[PDB]
Design a protein around this ligand. Structure first.
Ligand SMILES: CC(=O)N[C@@H]1[C@@H](O)[C@H](O)[C@@H](CO)O[C@H]1O
Ligand SMILES: OC[C@H]1O[C@@H](O)C[C@@H]1O
Ligand SMILES: [Ca+2]
Lengths: 131, 129, 131
């Protein structure tokens, strides 16, 4: 019985793909901490969400691929731009096929993500139901 | 037929009317038609435990209220001047067949996101009963 | 057929550093694994869970998401700052839990947290997969 579910955070992260390098949970290991990409094994409906810390301007999007082809989607921004912590958040259900990938991408013009130990940024996903 | 899931989005540059139900006019996924884009309401077909969650972009004050069968369940507010932020909220509810769920605004009604900042509402059945 | 899910709001006193944040008003508590008296979820059914909160605030807020069975430890800290304004912030995490492990939110020196009709704070969690 499949149990695909993950959460990953930023600690020592290494382009426009936001890599969450530190794994908290990764049941069935669908998430790749080296690339920031979730890989679908079990086709079905999944929920994905992020809560990412910025101090300046940030725009993020949950994006997917099918057969390697990129599928652009909605974005979520915080542009308060005052140097204080702000958490930008977003999420959606995606129906995925086997081999589809899902990741978080930043706007190359609005991409500030906090780096440090004071607080955290997270990317999570889980299967809602197969097929 | 036996599951329930949706993600809907508000695709328009014009905000809701003050003190009104928020209509999400566009569908990312809605296989059972449980969210009705013409009324702006979710109506329960399969009874059980649901998760509801939203992320709404705004460039002026916004409060989002979640209603269940005519009763206000939760309210979350974010205040901003000119710049863009995301107001989020969510709750788990055990629903009976025919129950309606929707989002509304009060006097703080702004949903005018900047380019690349959108508004979404999702719901799904986790435990059927 | 393990149906485990809770949502509770806070209607309560200025929080102290290291204090457990109590969400006293229960909306949902299927299987009664959340305790509104303590503010803690205690795992009875080992498995994968998703935890999430939304906090209303009028100033700087940082919260620790805690896991443990007598001496809990923070998994992550979420901070969201606000200067002379009102905000709502959010955080979430997929966690593997074993029998007896608790999950809860813990206060810091950054303690601006509102819980009222019209500006709610909520803590929720649900079972994804037992095991
Ligand atoms: C072998 C393994 O799974 N551990 C890796 C670690 O080597 C690497 O430094 C990190 C990438 O940031 O991702 C971890 O999951
Ligand atoms: O009143 C505005 C709303 O109505 C809906 O049809 C779509 C839009 O977001
Ligand atoms: Ca803030």
């Amino acid at each position: 019985q499949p149990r695909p579910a993950f959460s990953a955070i930023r600690r020592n992260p290494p382009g426009n793909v936001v890599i969450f390098d530190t794994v908290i949970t990764n049941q069935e290991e669908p998430y790749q901490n080296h690339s920031g990409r979730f890989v679908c094994t079990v086709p079905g409906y999944y929920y994905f969400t992020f809560q990412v810390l910025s101090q300046w301007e940030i725009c993020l999007s949950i994006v997917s691929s099918s057969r390697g082809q990129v599928r652009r989607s909605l974005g979520f921004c915080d542009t308060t731009n005052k140097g204080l912590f702000q958490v930008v958040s977003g999420g959606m259900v995606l129906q995925l096929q086997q081999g589809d990938q899902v990741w978080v991408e930043k706007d190359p013009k609005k991409g500030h993500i906090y780096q440090g130990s004071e607080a955290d940024s997270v990317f999570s996903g889980f299967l809602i139901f197969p097929s | 037929k036996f599951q329930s899931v949706f993600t809907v989005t508000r695709q328009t540059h014009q905000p809701p009317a003050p003190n009104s139900l928020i209509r999400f006019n566009a569908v990312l996924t809605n296989p059972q038609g449980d969210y009705d884009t013409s009324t702006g309401k979710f109506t329960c077909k399969v009874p059980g435990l649901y998760y509801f969650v939203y992320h709404a972009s705004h460039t002026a004050n916004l409060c989002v209220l979640l209603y269940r069968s005519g009763v206000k369940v939760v309210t979350f507010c974010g205040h901003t001047s000119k710049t863009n932020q995301v107001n989020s909220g969510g709750v788990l509810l055990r629903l009976q067949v025919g129950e309606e769920v929707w989002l509304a605004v009060n006097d703080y009604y702004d949903m005018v996101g900047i380019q690349g900042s959108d508004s979404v509402f999702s719901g799904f059945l986790l435990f059927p009963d | 057929t393990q149906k485990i899910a809770f949502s509770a709001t806070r209607t309560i006193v200025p929080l102290r550093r290291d204090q457990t944040i109590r969400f006293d008003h229960v909306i949902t508590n299927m299987n009664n694994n959340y305790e509104p008296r303590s503010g803690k979820f205690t795992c009875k059914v080992p498995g994968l869970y998703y935890f999430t909160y939304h906090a209303s605030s009028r100033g700087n807020l940082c919260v620790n998401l805690m896991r443990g069975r007598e001496r809990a430890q923070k998994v992550v800290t979420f901070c969201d700052y606000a200067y002379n304004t009102f905000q709502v912030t959010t955080g979430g995490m997929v966690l593997k839990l074993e029998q007896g492990e608790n999950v809860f939110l813990q206060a810091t020196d950054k303690n601006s947290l509102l819980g009222m009709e019209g500006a709610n704070s909520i803590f929720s969690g649900f079972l994804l997969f037992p095991d």
